[PDB]
Design an enzyme around this catalytic site. Sequence first.
Site, PDB file in Angstrom:
ATOM      1  N   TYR C  98       0.766  -1.093  -0.114  1.00 18.88           N
ATOM      2  CA  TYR C  98       0.077  -0.136   0.095  1.00 18.88           C
ATOM      3  C   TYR C  98       0.759   1.253  -0.184  1.00 18.88           C
ATOM      4  CZ  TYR C  98      -4.212  -2.690   0.809  1.00 18.88           C
ATOM      5  OH  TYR C  98      -5.315  -3.651   0.767  1.00 18.88           O
ATOM      6  N   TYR C 493     -11.568  -1.140  -1.882  1.00 14.60           N
ATOM      7  CA  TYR C 493     -11.822  -0.851  -0.503  1.00 14.60           C
ATOM      8  C   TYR C 493     -10.530   0.092   0.280  1.00 14.60           C
ATOM      9  CZ  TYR C 493      -9.176  -3.160   3.011  1.00 14.60           C
ATOM     10  OH  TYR C 493      -8.323  -3.819   3.684  1.00 14.60           O
ATOM     11  N   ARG C 494      -9.385  -0.166  -0.304  1.00 15.21           N
ATOM     12  CA  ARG C 494      -7.945   0.450   0.034  1.00 15.21           C
ATOM     13  C   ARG C 494      -6.858   0.457  -1.071  1.00 15.21           C
ATOM     14  NH1 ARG C 494      -4.044  -1.012   5.047  1.00 15.21           N
ATOM     15  NH2 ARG C 494      -5.689  -2.760   5.457  1.00 15.21           N
TER      16      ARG C 494
HETATM   17  C1  LIG Z   1       1.861 -10.224   3.665  1.00 18.32           C
HETATM   18  C2  LIG Z   1       0.868  -9.166   4.041  1.00 18.32           C
HETATM   19  C3  LIG Z   1      -0.347  -9.381   4.726  1.00 18.32           C
HETATM   20  C4  LIG Z   1      -1.183  -8.480   4.887  1.00 18.32           C
HETATM   21  N1  LIG Z   1      -2.368  -8.937   5.520  1.00 18.32           N
HETATM   22  C5  LIG Z   1      -3.390  -7.937   5.875  1.00 18.32           C
HETATM   23  C6  LIG Z   1      -4.506  -8.233   6.627  1.00 18.32           C
HETATM   24  O1  LIG Z   1      -5.136  -9.540   6.802  1.00 18.32           O
HETATM   25  N2  LIG Z   1      -5.381  -7.469   7.022  1.00 18.32           N
HETATM   26  C7  LIG Z   1      -5.087  -6.046   6.570  1.00 18.32           C
HETATM   27  O2  LIG Z   1      -5.916  -5.168   6.962  1.00 18.32           O
HETATM   28  N3  LIG Z   1      -4.010  -5.472   6.083  1.00 18.32           N
HETATM   29  C8  LIG Z   1      -3.041  -6.571   5.701  1.00 18.32           C
HETATM   30  N4  LIG Z   1      -1.716  -6.294   5.334  1.00 18.32           N
HETATM   31  C9  LIG Z   1      -1.718  -4.771   4.750  1.00 18.32           C
HETATM   32  C10 LIG Z   1      -1.084  -3.846   5.682  1.00 18.32           C
HETATM   33  O3  LIG Z   1       0.191  -4.253   5.650  1.00 18.32           O
HETATM   34  C11 LIG Z   1      -1.783  -4.169   7.239  1.00 18.32           C
HETATM   35  O4  LIG Z   1      -2.767  -3.671   7.171  1.00 18.32           O
HETATM   36  C12 LIG Z   1      -0.675  -3.414   8.082  1.00 18.32           C
HETATM   37  O5  LIG Z   1      -1.071  -3.359   9.541  1.00 18.32           O
HETATM   38  C13 LIG Z   1      -0.840  -1.809   7.917  1.00 18.32           C
HETATM   39  O6  LIG Z   1       0.320  -0.982   8.369  1.00 18.32           O
HETATM   40  P1  LIG Z   1       0.858  -0.533   9.892  1.00 18.32           P
HETATM   41  O7  LIG Z   1      -0.882  -0.268  10.189  1.00 18.32           O
HETATM   42  O8  LIG Z   1       1.606  -1.157  10.676  1.00 18.32           O
HETATM   43  O9  LIG Z   1       1.490   0.551   9.444  1.00 18.32           O
HETATM   44  P2  LIG Z   1       1.431   2.358   8.808  1.00 18.32           P
HETATM   45  O10 LIG Z   1       2.178   2.184   7.937  1.00 18.32           O
HETATM   46  O11 LIG Z   1       1.252   2.629  10.191  1.00 18.32           O
HETATM   47  O12 LIG Z   1       0.102   2.836   8.157  1.00 18.32           O
HETATM   48  C14 LIG Z   1      -0.877   3.384   8.680  1.00 18.32           C
HETATM   49  C15 LIG Z   1      -1.612   4.259   7.519  1.00 18.32           C
HETATM   50  O13 LIG Z   1      -2.845   4.897   8.016  1.00 18.32           O
HETATM   51  C16 LIG Z   1      -2.670   6.120   8.135  1.00 18.32           C
HETATM   52  N5  LIG Z   1      -2.170   6.333   9.405  1.00 18.32           N
HETATM   53  C17 LIG Z   1      -1.327   5.513  10.374  1.00 18.32           C
HETATM   54  N6  LIG Z   1      -1.282   5.923  11.532  1.00 18.32           N
HETATM   55  C18 LIG Z   1      -1.997   7.102  11.721  1.00 18.32           C
HETATM   56  C19 LIG Z   1      -1.961   8.074  12.827  1.00 18.32           C
HETATM   57  N7  LIG Z   1      -1.440   8.000  13.953  1.00 18.32           N
HETATM   58  N8  LIG Z   1      -2.911   9.315  12.089  1.00 18.32           N
HETATM   59  C20 LIG Z   1      -3.254   9.326  11.078  1.00 18.32           C
HETATM   60  N9  LIG Z   1      -3.357   8.498  10.020  1.00 18.32           N
HETATM   61  C21 LIG Z   1      -2.534   7.379  10.397  1.00 18.32           C
HETATM   62  C22 LIG Z   1      -1.762   6.630   7.139  1.00 18.32           C
HETATM   63  O14 LIG Z   1      -2.574   6.820   5.924  1.00 18.32           O
HETATM   64  C23 LIG Z   1      -0.815   5.480   6.769  1.00 18.32           C
HETATM   65  O15 LIG Z   1      -0.262   5.424   5.518  1.00 18.32           O
HETATM   66  C24 LIG Z   1      -0.939  -6.997   4.691  1.00 18.32           C
HETATM   67  C25 LIG Z   1       0.203  -6.903   4.033  1.00 18.32           C
HETATM   68  C26 LIG Z   1       1.383  -7.575   3.815  1.00 18.32           C
HETATM   69  C27 LIG Z   1       2.529  -7.220   3.145  1.00 18.32           C
END
Ligand SMILES: Cc1cc2nc3c(=O)[nH]c(=O)nc-3n(C[C@H](O)[C@H](O)[C@H](O)COP(=O)(O)OP(=O)(O)OC[C@H]3O[C@@H](n4cnc5c(N)ncnc54)[C@H](O)[C@@H]3O)c2cc1C
Lengths: 550, 550, 550
Positions: C98, C493-494
């Site tokens: 993403y 959706y995303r």
């Molecule tokens: C192998 C693999 C499997 C995955 N499986 C899943 C799954 O089952 N379900 C799923 O949902 N996703 C999945 N993901 C997608 C995504 O990687 C996960 O949702 C992951 O948890 C999202 O990143 P993060 O929440 O750690 O990181 P972050 O990089 O923190 O992303 C948060 C994002 O939301 C916003 N954001 C975050 N924090 C804040 C804040 N404090 N204030 C304002 N905006 C904010 C920003 O737009 C940002 O880009 C997968 C990805 C991979 C590579």
Amino acid sequence: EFRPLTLPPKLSLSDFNEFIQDIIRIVGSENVEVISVDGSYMKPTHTHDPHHVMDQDYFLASAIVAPRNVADVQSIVGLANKFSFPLWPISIGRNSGYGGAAPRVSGSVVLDMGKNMNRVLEVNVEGAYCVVEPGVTYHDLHNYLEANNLRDKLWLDVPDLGGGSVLGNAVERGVGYTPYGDHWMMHSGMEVVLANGELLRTGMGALPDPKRPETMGLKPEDQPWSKIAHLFPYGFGPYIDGLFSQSNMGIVTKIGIWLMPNPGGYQSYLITLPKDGDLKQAVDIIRPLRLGMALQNVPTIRHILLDAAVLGDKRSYSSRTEPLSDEELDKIAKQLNLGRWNFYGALYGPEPIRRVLWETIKDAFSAIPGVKFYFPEDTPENSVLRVRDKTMQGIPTYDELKWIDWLPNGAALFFSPIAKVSGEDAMMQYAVTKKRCQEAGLDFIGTFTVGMREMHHIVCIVFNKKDLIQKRKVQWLMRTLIDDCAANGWGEYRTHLAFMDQIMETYNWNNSSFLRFNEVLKNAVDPNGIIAPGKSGVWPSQYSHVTWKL
Amino acid sequence: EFRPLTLPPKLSLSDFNEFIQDIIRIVGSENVEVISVDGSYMKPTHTHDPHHVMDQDYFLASAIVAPRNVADVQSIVGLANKFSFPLWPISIGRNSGYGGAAPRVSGSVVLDMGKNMNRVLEVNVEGAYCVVEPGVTYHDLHNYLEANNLRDKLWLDVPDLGGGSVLGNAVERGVGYTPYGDHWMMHSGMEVVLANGELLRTGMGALPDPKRPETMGLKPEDQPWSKIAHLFPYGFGPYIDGLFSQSNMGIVTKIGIWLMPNPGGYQSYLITLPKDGDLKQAVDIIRPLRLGMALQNVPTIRHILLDAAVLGDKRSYSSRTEPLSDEELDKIAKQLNLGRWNFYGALYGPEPIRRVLWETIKDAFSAIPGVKFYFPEDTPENSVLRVRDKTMQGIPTYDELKWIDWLPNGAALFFSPIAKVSGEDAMMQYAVTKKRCQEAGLDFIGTFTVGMREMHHIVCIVFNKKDLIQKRKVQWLMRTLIDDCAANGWGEYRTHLAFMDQIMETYNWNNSSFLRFNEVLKNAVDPNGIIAPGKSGVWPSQYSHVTWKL
Amino acid sequence: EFRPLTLPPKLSLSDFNEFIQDIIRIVGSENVEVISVDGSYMKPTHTHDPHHVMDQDYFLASAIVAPRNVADVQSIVGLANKFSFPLWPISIGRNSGYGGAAPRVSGSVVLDMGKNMNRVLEVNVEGAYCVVEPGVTYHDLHNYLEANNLRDKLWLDVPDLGGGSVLGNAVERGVGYTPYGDHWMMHSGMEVVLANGELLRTGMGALPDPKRPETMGLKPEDQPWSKIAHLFPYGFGPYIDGLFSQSNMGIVTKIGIWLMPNPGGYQSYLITLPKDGDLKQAVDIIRPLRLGMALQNVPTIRHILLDAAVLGDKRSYSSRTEPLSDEELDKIAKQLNLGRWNFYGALYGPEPIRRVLWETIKDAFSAIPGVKFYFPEDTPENSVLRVRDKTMQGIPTYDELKWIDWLPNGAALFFSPIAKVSGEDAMMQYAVTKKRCQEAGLDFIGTFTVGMREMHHIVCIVFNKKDLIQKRKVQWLMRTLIDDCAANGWGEYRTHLAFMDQIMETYNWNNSSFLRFNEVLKNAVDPNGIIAPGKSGVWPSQYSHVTWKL
Ligand SMILES: Cc1cc2nc3c(=O)[nH]c(=O)nc-3n(C[C@H](O)[C@H](O)[C@H](O)COP(=O)(O)OP(=O)(O)OC[C@H]3O[C@@H](n4cnc5c(N)ncnc54)[C@H](O)[C@@H]3O)c2cc1C
Ligand SMILES: Cc1cc2nc3c(=O)[nH]c(=O)nc-3n(C[C@H](O)[C@H](O)[C@H](O)COP(=O)(O)OP(=O)(O)OC[C@H]3O[C@@H](n4cnc5c(N)ncnc54)[C@H](O)[C@@H]3O)c2cc1C
Ligand SMILES: Cc1cc2nc3c(=O)[nH]c(=O)nc-3n(C[C@H](O)[C@H](O)[C@H](O)COP(=O)(O)OP(=O)(O)OC[C@H]3O[C@@H](n4cnc5c(N)ncnc54)[C@H](O)[C@@H]3O)c2cc1C
């Protein structure tokens, strides 16, 4: 008058009434009409679209106003800026297949320039040009030349019909069939009423005619023009003329149009191409000949149903309600002595020159098996060639109106993309369009008009205007064709009121840079957005896109 | 660099310094030059006017910046809008007689587009067009066609010299001598960086090329164009292309120019007209021929001193400091085997067609006593016909540069009015101009270039650039000629930096309606007035007229 | 530090320098990083997209700033509003597929909330909820529950990997696989730093905790919450919480997430579906069960290559470079003891209840020939079921990271449309997507995640990040899939950074009414447009659409 069917945006009935009383005192009760009938080509309607694809009253004027002269357009514009009343200027109102005289925005006053601003202002022999008002039709300009016997020195260049407006058509960048066919490129010197109501003359028309006793004290509209006005269109500085074609940037009150000298020799002709697939070889053949000027005018490639529909409705050839088959098109071709594609052209100039080119043309089209060559004399009295023989020498006719009657209450709507001058591209465009026409249940009917490095492909969609199901299929068709041609890299050059937004959305390279810039220009010159808002998809900022776009 | 001779209006030395460090980090120190030499045609100057009519440093850059590509122009535009720094874009900077590379406003950065944005982007044979960047000179485009052997299929159209820029010349609406001589009318599809810095493509260039794997992810400047971009210039809606010629509305980064197919036959020719007064009969003869296309290209009518000056300086024909007499001009004519007026032209196409037109031309010019007809073979090795034989087939040469050396430190300035294609008008303009040249103490030197319904009369004023008295007489001459021609109904089509305001003032019909409208457009699109303010007399609102006009 | 690779729009190097010195004095040099490496899942990069579909440095931070606490975000916001510096807030920065931690606008500061704002703020047993900061990954929350032995009373809900952020994922509306799988629907009480820098708490969090000696004098960020803050999300008045998911309307500093009580019984299971075409019958079966709650959690339908890619790279199953055939997929299925489609799920609660539902599930899936039923014990030690057995009970694992290694330098990009819970719709979406993947040269890899009335179809595009040709095909694929799904009535959706504008353009009912409204909201709340401009296609007014959209 008091109560219209539709009022323009944000305007009260009292403002409407005050406004209309204001205009009535300026132009008279005989030049104003409140809308409180599709008509004919002969007496076109000026209230709505007679070839209505949407419901009849979808695009509807609230009133029709006929200025007596340029001063009256200045006063009307002042009023519209006072009340914020959108104007929709028309010249003759015969934009059939393109909305007719209907406004994009319902409630607008249709401004009928052509009723009273009718004059052939000048016909200049040494400079081979004419100057004209919105009301001069091609038929009128023809009569003007004939009455003065000018036909022996100058010829006109006309579209398929003769009732249209010389200026009207040229500001839409319309096309004709002599060597002067690119209407818009033959202009030089236009007079415009700006949105602020100020008169402006372009090009060398901005270099004023030197003062002399005889022209002292004339209103600006009535002043003569300086010697080079209608001879060199560029003038000096930014060349702003094109901002006024297919635009809402001003109201064109006069225009100079260059006229071709009698060529001293003329011969029209018809080359019948037996097979549906012969389009490809023919266009390939046309390419080099059009570039090197063996093909002098704007020749056309008519599909057999265009010619067939000129000669008789669909009922006369079949009682079928669905699209004629391929085998039936071959039978109609044979019945009429035409091929599946018919190429119309003309040679101009002295015999020795006509001879050489004609042998070049003949010899090149000979690689197509079964090709046949005809001159007007060789064909029947009711042939299209005998009509187009007049058309390709600038003489106005009305015969080709008859294809709009292909179906019961036949209305026309034009799908008008542009194709490369190549058999490959032309077949591909054809293939795309034909397929969607058949899905829609309509006969494919069309012509290619051959430009120098492009061909204007006019797909003529004819439908029953009293058939709601087919109207919806026409609208489904048109919208899909736009998208499909866009996905194949082809754009339309001109369209109807209901498709303007969609067609402008197709010219969106670099995230719509092109319409943003038009928007910026438009709001600077029309701060009240009173001149035909929506024309070509360009909206003044008081017209929300969410609300108004189609 | 740190301290320029001149700073642009309202800018501090510190902002200048910040800005220039900002540009240096975008384009490199090799692409930026601070001005803290008239040069040659070979390596044109980019700091000031080499043919300076005002003092040499009158129109002066503060710095020269050479963008590496379109992204760089975008960033430079952003910086100029941040600091309000006026930019003066040039392509090659050889606008000799028109100010050269000098900015109207001193202190402006001269934007050198041509140094690094040099590419022949595409040469399309089926569509007979080419797409080019600012830096492609005609000589370069010629070499590109030769290297790939395209000369047998496609020819160019060139101005008298070969070093100019194809795009640069065309956006000035420059002229050439083959049938493709109306440079501006041969364009289709331009790319522009607006004042706001956004990239815009005109016409069919706004209809994007359909997506495909191979072109995914390309910056907008680097994307291909859709199939019809360089084939049909109109596109859809307002045709805004002309807002970009002779204007300050944008920075042109790429343009498509239509190329003429090898005509399959060519023959240049020279028709000498014995007497000074023969201009009149000749133009009256040229009129119908040009209108009916026996004259295919843009033929020229050179005055005897133009051809004489190509062959040798004034010192070689007389030691006189005052204008040569009429009797001397007859002697020079006789010495060189030329008339007092010399008509140059060319026949294109297959022999049978060339033959017929050539007899028509011959026969019509025969009504002038003493006329003589030459082909290049019939003239000496150093003749102008042998040079122009090349020129009328699109081959670039540099021979005609020699007339600028008529006088000691000869500089050129062009007085360029338009005339009707009529003996009467042409004589009269000639009479007006010749009278003022003699009052000024200068030899009359000039050419008429024959358009369809107009002639471009280029009076070539040559003066000693180190002679202050004569420079003042040049300026006295130019300004009086402008007024005189205006008082006789003629306007100039292009001019030098110091005459732009006076020439726009002449196109003042209806109280200057034309310039007010241009002003309205310009301030909408350039709210900081950073793109070439003053070009053509059009001034952004931050540039007080009292202060800046000349 | 002094000189970044990229500066944010309209910012000078000196303002950048001033700003960064200002931030350094608020948070320290240890918490700020100037960018003057793709990394791992273990130590994610915070400068750019590690799964780069565009060039690696296409989306690039100018600096990374790690606030120490909420006061620091407030001060950073003030500075960004002073300098107009765009901030891109991230929690963990693992949004793989993403865009990772990359900003939409290059030059933005990446705001790392997670490094220092790491705390599990509260785990409430009677209310079965937890309150968390950006830095609490699911693994961390899990360890917190284990250390205090809360696993016996409360379970978590996790996505496929365990390193993501609980809050981060939830504000993206991420999905999990227990009955608490709709992450966003499980929230109640969020704390946000607005664009103006003011602290705001939603719902019942706006009803302050009653004063008491122990909490007097605490900064607002440090105050306790009132009793109902994390129990009822609605509060009173407008429910504005959703304005903060998938938006740029604020910076989320804390959130409450509802936790499921230990269910007192759990059993995961795997139902293998032999044939590719069995998707249809399975979804038709899944529909009523999911609606009547025999299917309690969010069960998934994995395609055979997803499970295959978890177990080994493509090189381990074939040496082919092109997509594996259908016959090969059947062989891989057979090799691993899986079907072509594999349905994973879980039963929760007391044995008597698990029994009844399990017979209902069994019996309904029995209508599909060859279906086989497994519990974790029945499968091998390296199976996906044994991993997902953990996943459906909220235990974090990292095993499924291995499918990103399908290809050499495998990177992931997610195409994420929604489908009806119907065999017919699911097949059709599959057909559309599979066709385009094969045209692109990629193996189809995907999962459907089963919601109550919809399924989230995650097409997992894996490509070689060092292969420019395939990266371009990835981009060609993604963009065409978007259009194709839109033309069939399905929206994503995303999405990733490079597709956000194209995906918002698809939600254009009524001429884009939805985005205009979002724009109106965003410019009211962010007049300087400093919070993540462009997120989801929503652009503050200072970011020209022409310039910034993709
Ligand atoms: C192998 C693999 C499997 C995955 N499986 C899943 C799954 O089952 N379900 C799923 O949902 N996703 C999945 N993901 C997608 C995504 O990687 C996960 O949702 C992951 O948890 C999202 O990143 P993060 O929440 O750690 O990181 P972050 O990089 O923190 O992303 C948060 C994002 O939301 C916003 N954001 C975050 N924090 C804040 C804040 N404090 N204030 C304002 N905006 C904010 C920003 O737009 C940002 O880009 C997968 C990805 C991979 C590579
Ligand atoms: C059977 C048939 C055949 C046709 N064949 C051809 C053909 O060969 N070539 C061709 O080009 N067209 C053709 N058309 C299309 C159209 O019918 C003609 O172009 C026609 O001449 C255009 O209408 P008009 O000029 O009389 O009317 P108008 O209604 O005047 O249309 C003018 C339009 O241009 C603008 N306009 C007009 N006057 C002004 C003004 N004074 N100021 C500002 N804006 C103005 C407005 O947008 C208006 O909608 C054909 C139509 C039919 C039905
Ligand atoms: C002996 C001689 C003979 C000549 N003969 C001819 C002739 O036959 N025909 C003719 O037309 N001219 C002629 N010229 C005039 C002029 O020298 C040529 O037109 C020459 O090609 C123009 O300069 P250029 O195009 O190389 O240079 P440039 O200096 O590039 O001039 C371009 C000008 O147009 C604008 N411009 C250029 N590039 C851009 C851009 N990218 N974006 C925005 N604006 C831009 C600017 O206003 C600028 O001043 C002659 C000049 C001399 C000295």
